[PDB]
C-alpha cells in the first residue's frame, strides 16, 4: 500500500480487448 | 541472440505497462526468421494491439471534438493518423516477411491472417478517400482467406476461429457498411459454436464463451 | 510558436491521454518566459506528474519482481532504464522550476504551488538516488517543501487546497524518506485541525480525506 499524494490519477465489440 | 531474454524482457515490460518497450522486443525476436511458438505468437499481438490502440482511441477522441479555430484539431488528427499508419504498417511488414511465411500450423496461419485483416481494417478508418478502397480490399482478402481456413480445419468452438468471427463480422458492419452481411457472419458463428456446446471442457470453455458473449452483444447491439 | 496555440493543444493532448505531448506543449510555453496562468501552470503540473507517475509505477513494479536467478539479472537491467528515464523526467523539470518557473513568480500563491513541486520532484529522485547522492537530494527536497512551508503559513488561510496539498505532500515527505512518522503523523495532524476549524470552495475537502486516509493508515 502506496500512501496518497497530490495531484493523483457507445459501439463496436472486437478480439484481443484492452 | 538470447531471444529468452528478449521474450522475458517483454513479458517484464507487459507487467510495469510499457507497451512500446515489450513491441520492441517482440519484434526483435520475429525479426531473427525462427517461427514464434504461441506464446511470443501472443506476446507480439498484445504488445501492438495496445500500442495502436492508443492510437486509434486517442484518434477517436480528437475526431470527435473535430465534429463539434478547431484546425488545430485536425492537425493534431493528422499527426496521430501518422502515428498509427507507421504502426500498422510495421505490423504488416512483420506479417509479410516473416510471421505468415514461417506459419506451419494452420491455427497460426489462421491467427496472422486475422491480423492482417485487423491491422488493414485500422488502416481502412483513417484512409486517405482515394486509397480507402485498395486498402478495404486488402483486409476483406485476409479476413476471407483466414475464415476459409478456420472453417476447414478448426471445430466452431475454437476461439481463434470465434475472434475471427468477431471481428471479421466487425470488418462488414462498420468498414463495409453492410448490416445484413455482419448479422449473418456473427449469428451463425454463434449458432454453430453452441451446436458443439457440450465439448467445451471445464477448464477451457471460458476462452470460447466469452467470445461468443461478445458475438451475442454485437448482435443485439446490430439489431436494436 | 503560438503560445496560446501551444496552449489549446496541451488541453487537446490531455483529453486524448497523450502526456508526453502536453508536457512537450507545454515545457515550450514555460520557456517564453511569460508568468504561467493558474491555467498554465496546473497544466504544465498534469502533463509532468502524468510523465513522471507512468516512471514510478513501473519501478515499483520492476522492483518489487527483484525481491519477489537469471530473471533477477535482467529485472535489474530493465530497474535502471527506467530509473534513468525517470532521473531525466524529474531534471527536466527541475530544470524548469528554477530557472523560470521560480524566478518569474511573484505573488505568494504561484511560489508556494512552485516550491511544492520542486519539493515533489526532488523527492521522486529520492526514492531512487544513488547512494551517494542520496543526502544531497532529500536535502533539496526538504529544503524546498519547508520553504514553501513557512510562505504557505504566512500568506493562506488553512482551507486554501494549495496550502493543504503542501501538508500531505510534505507529510508524505517526512513518513516516507526522513523515516519519521511522528513528524508526518504530527505535521498532517497540524494541517486537518486547522483545515477543520476555520472551515469557511469544496477541493479542499478532497484533500482533507487523503489526510484522514493516511494518518489512518499510519495508525
Keep these: 500500500i502506496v500512501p496518497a499524494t497530490l495531484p493523483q490519477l457507445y459501439r463496436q465489440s472486437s478480439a484481443n480487448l484492452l | 541472440m538470447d531471444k529468452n531474454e528478449l521474450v522475458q524482457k517483454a513479458k517484464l515490460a507487459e507487467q510495469a505497462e510499457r507497451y512500446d518497450d515489450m513491441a520492441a522486443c517482440m519484434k526483435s525476436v520475429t525479426e531473427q526468421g525462427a517461427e514464434l511458438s504461441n506464446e511470443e505468437r501472443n506476446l507480439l499481438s498484445v504488445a501492438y494491439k495496445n500500442v495502436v490502440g492508443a492510437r486509434r482511441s486517442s484518434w477517436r477522441v480528437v475526431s470527435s471534438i473535430e465534429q463539434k479555430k478547431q484546425q488545430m484539431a485536425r492537425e493534431y488528427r493528422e499527426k496521430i493518423e501518422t502515428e498509427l ?3 500498422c504498417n510495421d505490423v504488416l511488414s512483420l506479417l509479410e516477411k516473416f510471421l505468415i511465411p514461417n506459419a506451419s500450423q494452420a491455427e497460426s496461419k489462421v491467427f496472422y491472417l486475422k ?3 485487423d491491422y488493414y481494417r485500422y488502416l481502412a478508418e483513417v484512409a486517405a478517400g482515394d486509397d480507402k478502397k485498395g486498402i478495404v480490399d486488402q483486409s476483406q482478402q485476409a479476413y476471407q482467406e483466414a475464415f476459409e481456413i478456420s472453417k476447414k480445419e478448426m471445430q466452431p468452438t475454437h476461439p481463434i476461429r470465434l475472434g475471427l468471427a468477431l471481428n471479421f463480422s466487425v470488418f462488414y458492419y462498420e468498414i463495409l457498411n453492410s448490416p445484413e452481411k455482419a448479422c449473418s457472419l456473427a449469428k451463425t458463428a454463434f449458432d454453430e459454436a453452441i ?3 457440450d465439448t467445451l471442457s471445464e477448464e477451457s470453455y471460458k476462452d470460447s464463451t466469452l467470445i461468443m458473449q461478445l458475438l451475442r ?6 439489431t436494436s
Design chain 2, 115 to 117: 491480423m492482417k485483416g
Design chain 2, 217 to 222: 452483444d454485437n448482435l443485439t447491439l446490430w
Design chain 2, 195 to 197: 451446436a458443439e456446446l
Design chain 2, 85 to 87: 499508419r507507421d504502426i
